[PDB]
Write a protein that binds this ligand. Sequence first.
Ligand SMILES: Nc1ncnc2c1ncn2[C@@H]1O[C@H](COP(=O)(O)OP(=O)(O)OP(O)(O)=S)[C@@H](O)[C@H]1O
Ligand SMILES: Nc1ncnc2c1ncn2[C@@H]1O[C@H](COP(=O)(O)OP(=O)(O)OP(O)(O)=S)[C@@H](O)[C@H]1O
Ligand SMILES: Nc1ncnc2c1ncn2[C@@H]1O[C@H](COP(=O)(O)OP(=O)(O)O)[C@@H](O)[C@H]1O
Ligand SMILES: Nc1ncnc2c1ncn2[C@@H]1O[C@H](COP(=O)(O)OP(=O)(O)O)[C@@H](O)[C@H]1O
Ligand SMILES: [Mg+2]
Ligand SMILES: [Mg+2]
Ligand SMILES: [Mg+2]
Lengths: 319, 258, 338, 328, 255, 340
Amino acid sequence: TLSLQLPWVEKYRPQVLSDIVGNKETIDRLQQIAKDGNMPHMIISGMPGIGKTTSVHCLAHELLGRSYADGVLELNASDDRGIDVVRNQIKHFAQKKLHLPPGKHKIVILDEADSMTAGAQQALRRTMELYSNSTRFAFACNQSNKIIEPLQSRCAILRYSKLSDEDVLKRLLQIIKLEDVKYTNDGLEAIIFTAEGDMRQAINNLQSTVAGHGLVNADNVFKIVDSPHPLIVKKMLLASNLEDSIQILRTDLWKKGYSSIDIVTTSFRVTKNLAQVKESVRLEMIKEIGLTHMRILEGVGTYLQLASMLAKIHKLNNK
Amino acid sequence: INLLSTISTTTKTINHENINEISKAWEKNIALKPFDIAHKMLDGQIYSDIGSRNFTLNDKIALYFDDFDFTPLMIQENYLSTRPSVLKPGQSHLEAVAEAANCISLGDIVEKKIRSSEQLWSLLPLHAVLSSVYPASKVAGHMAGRINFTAWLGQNSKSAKYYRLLQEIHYHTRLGTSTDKIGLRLDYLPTFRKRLLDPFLKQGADAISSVIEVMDDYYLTKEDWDSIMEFFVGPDVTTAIIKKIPATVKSGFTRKYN
Amino acid sequence: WVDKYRPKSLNALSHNEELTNFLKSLSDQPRDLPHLLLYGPNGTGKKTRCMALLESIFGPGVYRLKIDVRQFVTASNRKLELNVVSSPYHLEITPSDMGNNDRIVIQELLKEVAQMEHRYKCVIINEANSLTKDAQAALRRTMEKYSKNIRLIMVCDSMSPIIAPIKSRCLLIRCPAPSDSEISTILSDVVTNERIQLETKDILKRIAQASNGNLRVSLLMLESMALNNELALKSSSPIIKPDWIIVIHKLTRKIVKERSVNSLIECRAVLYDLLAHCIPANIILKELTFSLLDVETLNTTNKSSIIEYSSVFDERLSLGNKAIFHLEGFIAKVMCCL
Amino acid sequence: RSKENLPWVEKYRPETLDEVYGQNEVITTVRKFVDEGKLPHLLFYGPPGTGKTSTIVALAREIYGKNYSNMVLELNASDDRGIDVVRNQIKDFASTRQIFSKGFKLIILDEADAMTNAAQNALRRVIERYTKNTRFCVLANYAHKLTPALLSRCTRFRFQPLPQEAIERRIANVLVHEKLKLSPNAEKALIELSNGDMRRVLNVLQSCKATLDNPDEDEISDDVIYECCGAPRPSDLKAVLKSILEDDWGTAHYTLNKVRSAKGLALIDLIEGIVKILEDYELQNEETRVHLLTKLADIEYSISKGGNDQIQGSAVIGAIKASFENET
Amino acid sequence: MLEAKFEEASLFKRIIDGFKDCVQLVNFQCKEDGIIAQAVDDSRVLLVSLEIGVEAFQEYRCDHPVTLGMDLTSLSKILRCGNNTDTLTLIADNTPDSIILLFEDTKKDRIAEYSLKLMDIDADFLKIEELQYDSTLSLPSSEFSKIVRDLSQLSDSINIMITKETIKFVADGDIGSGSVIIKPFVDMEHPETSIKLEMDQPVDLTFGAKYLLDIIKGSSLSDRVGIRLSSEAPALFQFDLKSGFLQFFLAPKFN
Amino acid sequence: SKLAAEQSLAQQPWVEKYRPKNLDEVTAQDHAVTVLKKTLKSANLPHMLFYGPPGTGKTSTILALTKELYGPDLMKSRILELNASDERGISIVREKVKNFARLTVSKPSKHDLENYPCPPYKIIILDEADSMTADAQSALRRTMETYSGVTRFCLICNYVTRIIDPLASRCSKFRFKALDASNAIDRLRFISEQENVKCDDGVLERILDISAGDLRRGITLLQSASKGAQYLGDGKNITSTQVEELAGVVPHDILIEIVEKVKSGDFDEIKKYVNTFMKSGWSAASVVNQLHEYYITNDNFDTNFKNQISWLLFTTDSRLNNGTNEHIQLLNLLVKISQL
DNA sequence: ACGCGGCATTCAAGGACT
DNA sequence: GATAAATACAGACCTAAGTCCTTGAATGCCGCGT
DNA sequence: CTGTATTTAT
Ligand SMILES: Nc1ncnc2c1ncn2[C@@H]1O[C@H](COP(=O)(O)OP(=O)(O)OP(O)(O)=S)[C@@H](O)[C@H]1O
Ligand SMILES: Nc1ncnc2c1ncn2[C@@H]1O[C@H](COP(=O)(O)OP(=O)(O)OP(O)(O)=S)[C@@H](O)[C@H]1O
Ligand SMILES: Nc1ncnc2c1ncn2[C@@H]1O[C@H](COP(=O)(O)OP(=O)(O)O)[C@@H](O)[C@H]1O
Ligand SMILES: Nc1ncnc2c1ncn2[C@@H]1O[C@H](COP(=O)(O)OP(=O)(O)O)[C@@H](O)[C@H]1O
Ligand SMILES: [Mg+2]
Ligand SMILES: [Mg+2]
Ligand SMILES: [Mg+2]
């Protein structure tokens, strides 16, 4: 078909701050700031798909009213991460004179701010303070650690958290009711489980299920969206017997098409994040997994090395 | 001040009831300096059963990742200067030190693999574990003395300087001697001392001519002589020997060579 | 001196007559000569035999060596300089002086001399073990493509670092170390020519047995003890051991006596002191292990564990840039064994 | 050329969405997506030779027609993975219209797992901003290399390794296109050695056709397949394993040496086959499996680093014998 | 064999310089009617369609159809090796490989023989669609290039609006905005300076500054440029030569 | 011209003198040369992966195939050779290789088509493709695929594991078998007869046995033995013991001495005998090979002893192939066998 | 024709890589 | 004014490696004015 | 940790 329909993530992107479901304290604080005015400098950080860009965009829209065209400067940090940007474009926008409602000021939105280079970030330090009376900067990034500490000092540290299953279920139910989709409770629960708090993943998976099969049922959602790799990897690592681990590997990972490097990397990540196993045993399994990773990266990527790694882990656990 | 401004928009009374949530959301995550990483990584409470839940393994890996160029060196330099407190029943301090050193050897292998022509940077968490966390967990406890800085850097620079000097000396004497760079230091240098420095020790200022003949036989200079006199170790150190040589002898040697 | 008396021709060689006959057999028809790789114990006389073969193939002017400087550029803008000893009929490359950039020196200089051209020029790679695997991989095709213009002769001590294709492409010439009797005969000739008074001749055999087959070390030790006894060797003349030997021996005594971490302080201190003064770590491990084996107090189990851990940490050293990181581990493991 | 002078791997590349087999779920899901028009951002991650590139090229043909090479920005991410690409080419293509016909824009990124992290961080906003008139497809063999942000904005489809039936149908189509015949046992051996990759199947089929003296009338038997591929026959594998298990060391060494020398089989393939056979076994104790797997893994790694073939074979014999000696 | 001779060696120089920056890969296919060249930019935003005719060549001979592919970066380098007072000769053998360029001047006996290795460019679609565009206008090339280069400094997007006898170029950026208003006027004294505009329906679309600046590099070929616009159709930027034309097909942005 | 090259080759090392000029001269790697010969008639050469032990004939086979395809004169224009001596980074893959592949096939001359097939493509030969990084091979992944119409790719590597999986998947895998005595004996006999080399009954078989799957080493050994025999002037035949002496082969008596010293479990005596042994240049790998042969072949040792000694020798070989010190590993192995 | 004047392009140094 | 609490804070910074990225300096060609 | 520096307290 020549034309396409808009995705549900962008078509149903919240246009007001109330539609945002998660992080109730932060959303209420941003709504109070929007009503009262005098927006402070901030960095918004968290996981992908929990509503950081949407929150800042709704805040800017509501704060600036009809003046969003001029008062808002949109600059994807990854696209424009040079000191030249700060020297010319950001500085000229900050020195720009614009008549606004009393409380409100001009807003700079720098999405994906974690990718800004050191030079541009350091140059922004004085632009943040010199033109603060007229210009207010806003930062959105996946990881706040990439942003230098002095820049974090000048702004409010507003930190987001992974979306709870209840809020994702509420948003999914709202979209389902609005667009008349047939669903089952098991299917919605499975979509929430696969999303793992990423609302964007949940909505994309709902779109895929609806378009492909037409009914939101557990069977369809599992065929169209596979079970999360770390869970099968953890089940393989935490099996009681060696033969069980070998069987889980052969069936779920090797025969299904997962690569050796992916398997070993996910095993390392799961092992480092495991909590039931004591730290010493966890560390020695990490050692064995790292040896297997070294062999795979040197070029020996085979079922034999993965089985040997499982055998070493089981020997380590069996004392 | 920014926290006070931002919080006060919604909550008008900051009290002891919400101080915990305010602190947990506004805490500064500042990268620890390579000394605080050494202190915290070499701590018994961190690797304890209770401490493991509070400070998880991923936190330890991130603590490494704060400084990925100095933590392996700091742990290697200060893993055997701590009083252990996590020793297994039937394990002494020396056994834990040996296991930790084995782990640092594996971590050095991993680092060489990462920092070579292959550039296997995906093994960086494995290096974090092998270099910092496992060796420190083996010898975790209380700091006996002070946390010293890595001595490997200065000794490596000294080794590079001495290798440059040995290269110059070997290439000067290449025509005379059919040797390699290492073999010269291994074998000839002790005899070169006996043919250069000992005559000044026994014959006196009259052995200057023979010494000059020896240097001219292999195209050596005063700088070459000084560099060879700085190459010996242990019993054969010449730092005090050259001082005890009369200043007249050294001055006459310099003037005669010039 | 060692350099004072060195054979300058094949017919002047006096030890391992089989090797001399093999070299003359190769020199009989020199237009058909494979690439060579001289290997054997260090100090045998492999370089002398290679240069004698060169003199046999070419004229007697191969010994007129001249040092030249050939600046090279690495992948980065850094400038690197090499001293290339050269002769009218041959040139010598010792890539151990450079670090990981020996590959560049190989591929540029050898290809250049190939384009430059008794139709072949022999290149002597004195240090072949320090050649990185990448450098040998680059040299793998240089030997075969330019076999009509350049014929490499390689000097080596242990063939294990050298990769299989390089050994395959080149003829292997074994060099047995001189026997004690031949070393004693050479020392007798030297002392006769150098006018060194000998009280008896058992001194020469003692020096030969204290060199472990090395002739360079034998002559150096001869002259070293000739200076401490006023050019007159006596029966009770002490055997001159180099400084690093004494330091390593004291290290073994300390490891045998004090098996503590507090002793590990000074053990690491001595290892650092040795490493900072132009001493390789593999040599340190070899001498330390063999001196530890010579300790009479230790029983067979300790000796076996020591040699096992020595092999393990030798592998670790061979696969590791930071040498003390493995040396300290070996010493600590030996202390735990004891 | 006429597409007749090309290797069978490229000659038999699918041209329409109906010639891609095995990935039926993905094929029907994508066909229904394009038919109804809600085509989301696609992520085809799977093992090599599963048809991901063929699937997306057939998608381009079915979406835009025969003129699909000019209305689609197909970028080899391995060849050009810089952030300059995202800033200039990808962004200008997404922003602008089509020079040929009205319609949406599709950008296919092949081997995006080699893209630098800066490039993906730049793309994670280009994809979102221009979603109204541009769609992105990401193909990557490895999903760990790709940034997590790039895995949140693209719908994920997993390309399973090609099953038996799809490989049989493609083999039949290739056999019909050429003048060739395949024995059922030879086809079974080819399927087993394929490991789910059609690339290997086509390469081995072409090599066996070349091997055939007069391909017009003769048949490719299992012997031809094994000889041209070089893989060991199952009979040789069983004989070697039986000789190692319950025979004397001298006889076992003789059997392994004669099996290797007679057919030219490599030792590493013998180890893989022996691992496959002994995995199917039912073992009394756990320790024997652990020892067998560990020792065989180190032997295979040392073979990957090279060395002495006879020593490695004797090591295999000793490891197997000790492991089954633990079962007493 | 192909033996195409230019009386003005600088003509092919100017044509190649017109679209050297726009594209690097172009298929110069030579037939009996003349040389036809077509190429697409890496971003696939501009279509270049060159059509040289036999009248341009002093002597043109093409035995059989031939497709000559080359790199514009290297070919332009080859062309800068000729003086103004020379005659170019394009030579290609029966099998297309290693095109030969000959720069000859007979007043002072000099010969310049240069070669360029051909490349296998698979894309040979060779399609342009004649459409009844909503508006067809013609203005001097220098004025259009001046307007484009003056408005490209304000922003990266230039908006062109066609209304009843009014042509407007609008560029709104971060430092400000600007709009140039011109009307179709006919001057009898100097016909070259006149501006024509035949409009059917109002036209409103936006283009990119980089591609527009790349297009105006072709102003060195002809003194007047014709621009044809239509609703959601490729804007046709046409430079008419003595024997043929050079057309830039731009794709507008999305509203 | 041809006479000068013929004389030059007539006096060069025998490793290069008898380099196979044609595909027929390949001695034992039939399973690949038959495919290339049947592709000679056609023009559908697949992407090829040549992986095998060193000295098996991959380079010779791929140098004869392109010759038979294109002709001596045409081959230079149609062939790009890039070894490990040239840079193997991403840039050399994205610029040199891409430009060469993108270039149109060069025009064959009238002499070329009449005699030689001259297929309408060109082969890029990448010697030692294992040394290349995974990034360069990833870049080549689509470079070979897109331009397969006019360009063909051949990769030669000692170890197939170094090559990334998709690259090996695209290229056809041709395993060059080891060149043992049985398969290369005819070639070695031909070379010996061509130079009038005189040997006993078992010299050639023993030469190939010591070579252990490498024809290059056997050729070099035969050349050295012939040179020694010619220098001797005795006029007799080369004897197997002479070859073993010239091949770095430990004498049997010394091997029995080491075995006897291992039998008596005294650490000091074993250490002394190894110290005396390393005073001769017997390579450690050549000692481990003979120890393995003697211990495994002999039937006087128990099965468990064989199982343990095989793993010990495997570990020693693995450690020795990493660049360790021969003396320490040899002593460790001998001590472990003594305790066995 | 002949000389500056910005502006595009090429070169070189520093930092980072989970 | 000296000596304790009570605590914040400094101890130090290397050389290679491959490839992408950015920033400033040095470089080139091309348009306008006289 | 050890050693040095600064501010409030005795
Ligand atoms: N499902 C399939 N049906 C038919 N032929 C297939 C299929 N999968 C692979 N092939 C064949 O294998 C060739 C390679 O397919 P590709 O799609 O290029 O491989 P791939 O799945 O993209 O894996 P890469 O290239 O390593 S990422 C095709 O040209 C076909 O000839
Ligand atoms: N199959 C063979 N038939 C005849 N001679 C051979 C054969 N294989 C090797 N040779 C001889 O050995 C020489 C070298 O062969 P190569 O093909 O270079 O070996 P190789 O496979 O390249 O080993 P590498 O380069 O170390 S992987 C040839 O010139 C021949 O003299
Ligand atoms: N808390 C939320 N409530 C409602 N929708 C959400 C929420 N979080 C994410 N979304 C949906 O996800 C889509 C994109 O999320 P976005 O805000 O871009 O993620 P990120 O915060 O990582 O930038 C939006 O269209 C929005 O509909
Ligand atoms: N056949 C020989 N006869 C006499 N002296 C010899 C002989 N071979 C070696 N030498 C002595 O060895 C010295 C050089 O040893 P060298 O060749 O550097 O050892 P390496 O084998 O480690 O290169 C010379 O000074 C020479 O006197
Ligand atoms: Mg966002
Ligand atoms: Mg693909
Ligand atoms: Mg080769």
